[PDB]
Design a protein around this nucleic acid. Structure first.
Ligand code: ZN
Length: 1843
RNA sequence: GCCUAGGAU
RNA sequence: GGGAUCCUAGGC
């Protein structure tokens, strides 16, 4: 700790500015050794610096020797009788007036004003005495709120502050030095404030340690470049390059890379694109539609022809009851559970049959028994026979099988009921019959014969003949297929609620167990199409791809397939949507005369496409549709890339895709049809929207492993050609790695072009020195700016999951073990063999025997091994055997298992474990267990000393120890759990599966806590958690800080098409990157053109675009490939080290540049990790290929790259190359680079030709808007235009920026960020928004999905979607919700919306509309009543007799009280009876990824106790339904769409408060919602609704639009917050963004409306819309800075009268009403400043802190007197704004509270000095104002003022 | 492979 | 990716 004081003493000796006035305390601090002495001297030094800086900035000389005002005056030559001893911190005299000063620091507005008022009273108590010598005193006060002075570098400042606080943090010393008051004041003074600068300059508190490796890098980055070239010079180089390029090109030495377009060739190649197996020339629609319906199982089932055709049985009740019993894990699943449970349902069906001849619940020999299981009957009889036989033998080794069977039945049923009756309710709802069990049944069982069909499931494919129906019977134009598909998809989705059961029959014995299988069956689901039923059958549960089978009763097993439950979602219940989609889509192109005939064919084709998408959803069918957009984009263009068509040829596997290809090719050939020309825009829209029919599938991933391998290959494969791949770089970098790094850094800049015997070689990384020098020089010469930059010099730019590492020692592991991994792989392989491999290969194959040997090796139960030796593989096993043998030979803190030591009946424990496995501890149920059990458990735990001290404290155990004695057992049980932290292999597998990892993961905040808790300032700030904290390093090498290097990790982010990469960091990597990110973004913010962060740029982009397509100017829409993995931080550093910013200052520039150099140098050395499963799978491939068990495909380069390093020893773990930039990490710097480079390139092209170009960017995309000249030239000299484009390609390639083959050039479209535009018409996107809105449901409260879908629909409607679609979607969602039977309240969603209900409505306005529609003739007067009420209130007549009198008050008859307080008749007596059931009127509903799983979770959660009691309990929803159904005065009511709302009588409104506690009346909610919305929106929403019939039909062309705008002081809000709720205000706005502790507000206008609005609220963009003017008719319409400147003026004027204050840069700015350099133009309120205009400009709006002199109006300072400005005994000028009644009211309120003579004198003086200027007072009153202000004594004050 | 009793899912 | 039984003891 001594080193701390040492180094800080060194700093304060060095960096302290030379001034002898600091020397004294300097000495006093540089000599002490006692801690307390050092703290005192340091704090005194800091306060001295503060007061010095203050007295300098104000203009008062520093009282150094600490004189006294008596002495201060008497040594100045005046007489002073006697004073009280006061010590000033500075003073000054001017003639007969005096100026004092006093300053301090306080960081809390509560403890701020105290010092202010104390100093003011201490000064006035001396002014009163001073007044009698004819001398004026002016008591200045200053209130700085930070110790950040100006004579001291700030990093030294806080480096001193924190070490002082630490030395002060001696516990014993702090205690035995002072009390808690001053301790608390001091600790919050060294608060480690975030300061005013960036947060990286703190680097200067650490060593350099930059010995040798850091030099040559900078040299190379600075060696060849020449960043000084003049402006004119660059023209020469540019011209020479252009000339040599054109010359060497025209002679045909380089390619052309660009082709002109022709529709013929494009169509021809698009047709013959896949021409190797689509043996077709032309296409007939008829044969197509014919062979479609007979394609594949689902299709052949849909369009088929089937189905030309309540009992309260005794098979359901039993089943429901047994299901419920099974749910709770009561019974021990042991040697034979489910068999008896099957026998019981067998007897149930037997009994039920012979009474009413039921025909249900049966397929051949099958019956859905318990958990959707479909058992046979024969094997049941056999196993029952065998069971009773061996049981009789056990009785032998008397009774008959009947007797023992009924005995078991009686025993199990009795145990069942006995367990149930502990807590569970009984037969009361379970209406069962104990006659089912006959006194003899086993015989009756053995005499049951049913005949029928047999069930089968066929795995392998078949032929198209086992289908016993007639294929083509349905028709396209009808909508049966969609409903069949909906039903089937729902039957699929529902296949997840099954729980993993325990099978009964292995069902097969032999390798045919994957061939057609039928002995028994397994689980099954039920669904109805129109008439009869159908069973859907599967075998194993979960959510993994498997087989299925569709069984029926009249025939067996219509088909079978290979689907997967998820990914089939977005079709359920949505049938009348898709049809409407297709219809409105067709509706566009239906007027093309040249297409009149075969139009119906188009219809069929469109429909067919959609059904195909829905029937066979698969990965590689998405990209085919997506890529289509680029083709159509190319069609309308002019020039396209040379190598385009070879992109749309990815990969196809099975047939269906080729069917889709043929269909779409036919449709394109028919739509395009070169001999038709009429409607181009509509066909454009049609095809384009057809291309977006890809989102309909899903966004998820098909697999995991082969999804990770792809991304890993994408990562690695391009970093190998360049020839630089390091491996396992240790934290201490050896020399060879540094050497290779230098060599590669040199190689990177070795690019060349157009001057060589080889010419340019595209598609290879690197930058050439010529172009880089040209760029840098042309940038430094200011040849890339405009007036918005030359006039504004660039100010200094300095003013999810996270990985947790492992640890074995000081070091950190970085390499997996070899032999451990070998053992792991072997084990896994043995598992794979044991599960499936053993049932596929023959026993006389060598591979089978090998696997057998390796399995009996690894677990417990040579001529073959000799042949193995002859098969080469000899030594591999010889070593591996002993290796893994030795690996396998090598292998009281309170916990959860201890429960088994207390609770003997385990069933309770299983209950508890389930409940915890569902809900948190905080919301555990009270009634899961018997009430006595809690007390008995608490007793049995408090007895046993062990667990007692393990959870009780004898001296969080405190809260439990205390509560147990007080006998609140439930809180005790919950607490003991909150401590419990519940929230044949011969070795241990899990330990191995954990040892051979390296990195683990954690959430965002779980680590932020564990960080912030281990430091002083518990306010999370950037530069506090890595610089000044425990566990941080001291110095740093050229590689990284002494903690280590910058790790990372890999994963994938999924989208449509392919998947992008995802880097993940640790805490430190994030913390350090964030600084560079913020820096570069702040820097880019000054320059115009970027569009990644801003908003008001993107709209300018859109406006420029829309403007471009009116004159046919040639747009150029680009893109960029491999942007991520082909950028390098070396390039950023190199272009930075040559950047020269503002040239006025000298050093801080290079300081920042060096800091950034160090940061980038750290970043260049990252150590990317490699995932685990990738390594496991590749090792598996290796160990296979070694023996070559199953020869796979020919290995790519990655497998060899691995195996090479693998069969030498080392297993590759980390790779640290140079070539790759982070993918998504270093965004802002990449955008900066792209912007600068693009501007330079456009500059060059301007230099060559005679035109201009405008561009933009987000991260890699771009546009280019050719000027008029470059457009109009293109039509005469195509050669020159093409060569310009080519030279652009070349140049832009030289700077390491490529162009993807999908860019285009055109005159008819313009693309940006996927937002297309055309002339005249506009292009919507229907399919995208529809497919988005179809699946956006998760497992939240059903009151949130409402606003979710409402937001989605509001966003969509703005883009030309027609509203009918939206209503259909809303109805679909409501039906999906009703499927779970959640009783729909009134306001859940408004399924009636219109076109006015979005463009001018909120989320709730539509609620008001549905209510208005529901129950009229009541609101028809409530509206007028609220209208009168609001009209009266808006002018503030009562303004309080409603909020604090009615709103909070009990809504009992308050309405009638309003109606009598306003004079309108109250409602009827049969009005209050309306209400609406609200679940969760006490506490929100308790709750217990993907989408399907989310939906099944939401479907499950409802049932299981979604109800909280009065205090805390649990119930159901059916319960409350019954308990309402009891009371015979409660009448429900429904609407057409379905909206429950009730009628309950006021006569029993009380007297039965049991269930009625939930209900809530409707008109109350209507009133309050209406008032709130009206206050918020425009008050026009309280007219009278109406429907119009004033229109005749007009021929509505399908494309016609009409843009629209929606129909709509923060300082005052903040004022009211600080005036009403101070505690909430200080802790939520000041630390967020504010510093206004030293600010006054005692003179500010007030508003009553806003005040009461805020009191209620605390008590209780969307630019344009684009719609069709063919809809705008059928609707309804309803019937109805200068301020701030004048506020500051009146504030100053009012303060001028209360006292006298000096006018300086700190007095004025200290107020609140002031334009503190906000968004204000040059001249806005400068006319309303009088004598203060120039000061704001010349002084305030430049950063100049000085006092006011006489030269500031056109050497004594100025004094603000009453109204007019005064110098020493003379007036120069004045100013006086206008006053109002309310301002005077607030004035006389706040001033005339305690004293009187002050108000009288002030008013008299104001009247006097305002009369002598002859202004007029006739505009206001006096007497009534006084009365309204002083309600009891206005007479005497009237007399006083008027006298 | 079976019966009884229990434990774990 | 596509069929769930494991341990200990007692009588066998
Ligand atoms: Zn029946």
């Amino acid at each position: 700790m001594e080193d701390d004081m040492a180094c800080v003493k060194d700093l304060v000796s060095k960096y302290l500015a030379d001034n002898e006035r600091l020397s004294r305390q300097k000495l006093a601090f540089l000599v002490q050794t006692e801690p307390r002495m050092l703290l005192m001297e340091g704090l005194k030094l800091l306060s001295l610096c503060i007061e010095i800086d203050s007295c300098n900035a104000n203009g008062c000389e520093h009282n150094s020797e600490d004189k006294s005002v008596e002495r201060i005056l008497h040594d100045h030559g005046i007489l002073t009788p006697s004073l009280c001893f006061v010590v000033p911190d500075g003073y000054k005299l001017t003639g007969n007036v005096l100026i004092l000063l006093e300053c301090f620091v306080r960081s809390s507005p509560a403890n701020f004003e105290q010092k202010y008022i104390e100093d003011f009273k201490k000064l006035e108590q001396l002014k009163e005495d001073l007044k009698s010598v004819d001398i004026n005193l002016i008591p200045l006060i200053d209130g700085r709120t930070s110790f950040y002075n100006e004579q001291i570098p700030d990093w030294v400042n806080d480096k001193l502050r924190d070490t002082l606080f630490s030395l002060l943090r001696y516990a014993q010393e702090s205690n035995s030095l002072f009390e808690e008051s001053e301790y608390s004041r001091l600790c919050e003074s060294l608060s480690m404030t975030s300061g005013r600068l960036s947060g990286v300059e703190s680097l200067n508190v650490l060593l350099d340690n930059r010995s040798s490796h850091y030099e040559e890098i900078i040299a190379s980055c600075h060696q060849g470049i020449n960043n000084k070239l003049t402006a004119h010079e660059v023209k020469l180089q540019i011209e020479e390059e252009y000339q040599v390029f054109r010359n060497r090109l025209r002679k045909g030495e380089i390619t052309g890379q660009f082709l002109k377009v022709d529709k013929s060739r494009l169509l021809n190649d698009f047709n013959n694109l896949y021409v190797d197996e689509v043996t077709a020339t032309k296409d007939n629609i008829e044969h197509l539609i014919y062979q479609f319906k007979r394609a594949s199982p689902i299709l052949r089932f849909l369009y088929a022809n089937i189905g030309e055709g309540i009992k309260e049985c005794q098979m359901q009740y039993w089943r429901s009851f047994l299901n419920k019993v099974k749910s709770l894990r009561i019974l021990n699943t042991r040697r034979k559970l489910l068999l008896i449970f099957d026998a019981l349902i067998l007897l149930a069906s037997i009994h039920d049959q012979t009474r009413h001849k039921c025909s249900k619940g049966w397929l051949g020999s099958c019956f859905i028994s318990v958990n959707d299981r479909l058992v046979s009957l024969e094997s049941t009889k056999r196993d029952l026979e065998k069971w009773v036989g061996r049981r009789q033998q056990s009785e032998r080794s008397p009774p008959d099988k009947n007797q023992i069977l009924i005995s078991m039945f009686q025993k199990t049923i009795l145990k069942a009921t006995a367990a149930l009756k502990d807590v569970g309710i009984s037969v009361e709802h379970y209406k069962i019959n104990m006659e089912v069990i006959c006194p003899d049944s086993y015989d009756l069982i053995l005499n049951f014969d049913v005949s029928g069909v047999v069930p089968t499931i066929s795995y392998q494919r078949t032929e198209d003949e086992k289908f016993p129906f007639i294929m083509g019977g349905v028709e396209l134009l009808e909508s049966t297929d969609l409903e069949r598909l909906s039903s089937l998809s729902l039957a699929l989705v529902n296949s997840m609620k099954t729980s993993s059961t325990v099978k009964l029959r292995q069902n097969e014995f032999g390798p045919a167990r994957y061939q057609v299988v039928r002995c028994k069956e397994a689980y099954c689901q039920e669904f109805l199409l129109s008439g009869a039923e159908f069973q859907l059958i599967y075998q194993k549960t979960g959510e993994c791809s498997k087989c299925y089978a569709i069984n029926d009763n009249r025939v067996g097993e219509i088909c079978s397939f290979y689907a997967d439950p998820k990914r089939y979602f977005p079709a359920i219940f949505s049938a009348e949507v898709l049809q409407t989609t297709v219809s409105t889509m067709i509706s566009w192109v239906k007027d093309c005369s040249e297409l009149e005939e075969q139009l119906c064919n188009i219809n069929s084709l469109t429909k067919m496409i959609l059904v195909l998408i829905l029937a066979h959803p698969s990965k590689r069918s998405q990209k085919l549709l997506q890529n289509l957009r680029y083709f159509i984009m190319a069609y309308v263009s002019d020039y396209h890339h040379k190598d385009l068509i070879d992109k749309l040829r990815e990969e196809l596997i099975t047939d269906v895709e080729f069917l889709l290809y043929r269909l779409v090719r036919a449709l394109v050939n028919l739509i395009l049809s070169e001999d038709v020309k009429s409607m181009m825009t509509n066909r454009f829209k049609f095809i384009l929207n057809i291309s977006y029919m890809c989102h309909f599938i899903t966004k998820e991933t098909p697999d995991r492993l082969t999804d990770q391998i792809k991304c890993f290959e994408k990562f690695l494969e391009p970093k190998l050609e360049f020839g630089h791949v390091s491996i396992n770089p240790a934290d201490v970098a050896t020399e060879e790695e540094l050497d290779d790094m230098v060599y590669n850094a040199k190689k990177f800049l070795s690019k060349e072009g157009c001057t060589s015997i080889k010419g340019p070689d595209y598609k290879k990384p690197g930058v050439s020195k010529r172009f880089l020098s040209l760029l840098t020089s042309s940038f430094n010469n200011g040849s890339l700016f405009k007036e918005s930059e030359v006039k504004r010099e660039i100010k200094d730019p300095l003013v999810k999951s996270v990985v947790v590492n492992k640890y074995t020692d000081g070091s950190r592991v970085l390499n997996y073990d070899f032999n451990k991994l070998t053992a792991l792989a072997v084990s896994q392989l043995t598992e794979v063999f044991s599960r499936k491999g053993k049932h596929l290969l023959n026993k006389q194959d060598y591979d089978y025997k090998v696997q057998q040997a390796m399995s009996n090796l690894v677990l417990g139960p040579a001529d073959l091994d000799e042949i193995l030796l002859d098969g080469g593989a000899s030594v591999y096993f010889d070593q591996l055997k002993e290796t893994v043998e030795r690996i396998i030979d090598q292998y009281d803190q309170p916990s959860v298992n201890d429960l088994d030591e207390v609770v003997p009946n385990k069933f309770y424990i299983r209950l508890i474990k389930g409940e915890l496995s569902n809900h948190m501890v905080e919301d555990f149920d009270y009634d899961v267990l018997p009430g006595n059990f809690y007390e008995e458990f608490c007793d049995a735990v408090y007895k046993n000393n062990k667990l007692k001290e393990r959870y009780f404290y004898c001296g969080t155990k405190a809260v439990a120890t205390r509560t147990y004695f007080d006998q609140e057992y439930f809180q005790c049980f919950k607490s003991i759990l909150l401590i419990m932290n519940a929230n044949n292999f011969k070795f241990d597998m899990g330990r191995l599966s954990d040892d051979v990892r390296i990195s683990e993961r954690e959430s965002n905040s779980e680590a932020l806590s564990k960080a912030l808790s281990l430091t002083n300032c518990t306010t999370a700030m950037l530069k506090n958690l890595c610089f000044y904290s425990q566990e941080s390093p001291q110095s740093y090498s050229s590689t990284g800080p002494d903690t280590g290097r910058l790790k990372f990790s890999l994963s994938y982010k999924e989208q449509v098409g392919g998947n992008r990469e995802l880097y993940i960091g640790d805490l430190r990597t994030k913390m350090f990157t964030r600084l560079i990110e913020d820096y570069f973004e702040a820097l880019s913010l000054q320059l115009s053109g970027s569009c990644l962060n801003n908003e008001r740029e993107f709209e300018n982009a859109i406006l420029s675009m829309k403007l471009n397509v009116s004159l046919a100017h040639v747009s150029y829409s680009m893109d960029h490939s491999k942007w991520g993995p082909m950028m390098c931080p070396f390039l950023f550093l190199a272009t930075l080290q040559n950047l020269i910013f503002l040239s006025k200052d000298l050093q801080a520039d290079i300081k920042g540049r060096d800091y950034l150099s160090t940061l980038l140098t750290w970043h260049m050395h990252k150590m990317v990790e490699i995932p685990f499963n990738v390594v496991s799978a590749m090792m598996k491939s290796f160990i296979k290929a070694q023996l070559g068990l199953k020869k796979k495909t020919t290995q790519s380069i990655t497998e060899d790259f691995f195996y090479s390093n693998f069969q030498i020893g080392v297993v590759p773990s980390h790779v640290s190359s140079i070539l790759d930039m982070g993918q998504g990490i270093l965004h802002n710097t990449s955008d900066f680079y792209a912007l600068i480079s693009e501007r330079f390139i456009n500059y060059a092209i301007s230099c060559i030709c005679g035109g201009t170009i405008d561009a933009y960017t987000s991260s890699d995309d771009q546009i280019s808007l050719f000027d008029q000249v470059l457009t109009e030239l293109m039509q005469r000299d195509p050669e020159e235009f093409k060569t310009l484009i080519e030279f652009h390609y070349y140049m832009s390639d030289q700077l390491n920026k490529f162009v993807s083959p999908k860019s285009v050039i055109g005159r008819f479209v313009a693309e940006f960020k996927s937002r297309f535009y055309v002339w005249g018409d506009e292009v919507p996107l229907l399919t995208k928004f529809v497919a988005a809105a179809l699946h956006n449901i998760k497992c939240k409260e059903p009151h949130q999905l409402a606003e979710t879908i409402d937001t989605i629909i509001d966003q969509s409607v703005a883009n030309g979607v027609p509203v009918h679609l939206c209503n259909l979607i809303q109805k679909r969602t409501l039906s999906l919700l009703q499927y779970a039977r959640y009783p729909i309240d009134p306001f859940l969603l408004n399924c009636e919306t219109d076109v006015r209900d979005w463009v001018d409505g909120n989320r709730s306005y539509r609620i008001m509309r549905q209510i208005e529609r529901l129950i009229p003739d009541a609101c028809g007067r409530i509206r007028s009543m609220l209208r009168k009420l609001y009209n009266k209130l808006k002018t503030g007549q009562l303004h309080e007799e409603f909020t604090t009198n009615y709103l909070s008050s009990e809504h009992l008859s308050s309405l009638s009280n309003l109606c009598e307080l306003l004079g309108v008749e109250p409602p009827s007596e049969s009005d209050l009876e309306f209400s609406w059931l609200n679940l969760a009127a006490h506490h929100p509903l308790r709750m217990v990824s993907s989408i399907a799983s989310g939906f099944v979770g939401l479907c499950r959660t409802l049932g299981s106790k979604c109800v909280r009691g009065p205090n805390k309990e649990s119930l159901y929803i059916k319960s409350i339904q019954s308990l309402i159904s009891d009371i015979q005065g409660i009448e429900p009511l429904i609407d057409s769409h379905g909206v429950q709302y009730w009628r309950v009588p006021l006569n029993i409104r009380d007297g039965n408060e049991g269930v009625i506690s939930y209900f809530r009346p409707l008109l109350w909610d209507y009133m309050c919602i209406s008032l709130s919305t009206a206050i918020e929106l425009g008050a026009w929403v309280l007219g009278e609704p109406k429907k119009v019939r004033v229109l005749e039909f007009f021929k509505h062309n399908p494309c016609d639009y009409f843009p629209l705008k929606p129909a709509a002081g923060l300082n005052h809000i903040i004022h009211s917050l600080r005036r009403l709720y101070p505690s909430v205000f200080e802790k939520h706005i000041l630390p967020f963004m504010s510093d206004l502790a030293s600010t006054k507000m005692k003179w500010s206008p007030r508003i009553k409306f806003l005040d009461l609005c805020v009191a209620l609220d605390v008590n209780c963009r969307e630019e344009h819309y684009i719609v069709l003017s063919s809809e705008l008719r059928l609707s309804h319409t309803r019937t109805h800075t200068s301020d701030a400147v004048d506020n500051f003026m009146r504030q100053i004027y009012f303060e001028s009268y209360v006292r006298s204050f000096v006018a300086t840069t700190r007095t004025l700015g200290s107020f609140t009403w002031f334009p503190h350099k906000t968004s204000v133009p040059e001249g806005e309120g400068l006319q309303r400043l009088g004598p203060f205009s120039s000061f704001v400009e010349k002084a305030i709006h430049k950063g100049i802190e000085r006092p006011m002199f006489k030269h500031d109006l056109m050497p004594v300072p100025l004094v603000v007197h009453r109204s007019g400005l005064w110098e020493c005994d003379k007036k120069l000028a004045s100013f006086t704004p206008v006053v109002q009644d309310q301002d005077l009211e607030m004035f006389v309120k706040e001033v005339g509270d305690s004293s009187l003579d002050l108000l009288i004198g002030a008013l008299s003086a104001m009247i006097l000095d305002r009369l002598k200027l002859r202004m007029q007072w006739s505009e206001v009153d006096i007497v009534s104002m006084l009365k309204a202000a002083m309600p009891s004594n206005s007479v005497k004050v009237l007399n006083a003022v008027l006298e």
